[PDB]
Amino acid sequence: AGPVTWVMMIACVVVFIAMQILGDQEVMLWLAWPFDPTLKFEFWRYFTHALMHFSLMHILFNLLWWWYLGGAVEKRLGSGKLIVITLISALLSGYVQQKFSGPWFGGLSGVVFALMGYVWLRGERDPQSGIYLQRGLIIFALIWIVAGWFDLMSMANGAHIAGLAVGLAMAFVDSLNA
């Protein structure tokens, strides 16, 4: 699909590949959310946590959803919209994951859960936009959230709910200005 969808899939592959050459921990040291307030002005970390994945199914499953839902947002709502959904959601989901469990997390699923929230609510309140999420996925999303609450694995439950929430809020606002 779009330039933004694709730029983000290449970033996560490039970072994934570095984690394989350098090791996770080495890459985490630089891209993870600030663990020590001294690092708080290293601004990229509020975002870069999103680019890290820790297995191949981790990256594939995330890029999958990201491709499907992100491309749909870019295709219909434009690249500027997708950028804004990505940035605010990586930041806010990172922020809440950190409060939940500290700064050692990564993945794009926070941004994905925002996308699922946006695509579903926007598709429900403003079907005129031309996106919508099929119920089969809104059930898979729901199963996915709660399957993190019970852990059989190691999910970022603060990221999922925070991202999810962000995507419903952004979608609500956007379906008023419609």
């Binding site: 946590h49 999103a50 820790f54 997390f105 990564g106 999910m155 970022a156």
Partner: peptide, 4 residues
Amino acid sequence: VRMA
């Protein structure tokens, strides 16, 4: 580590 946790996976978002």
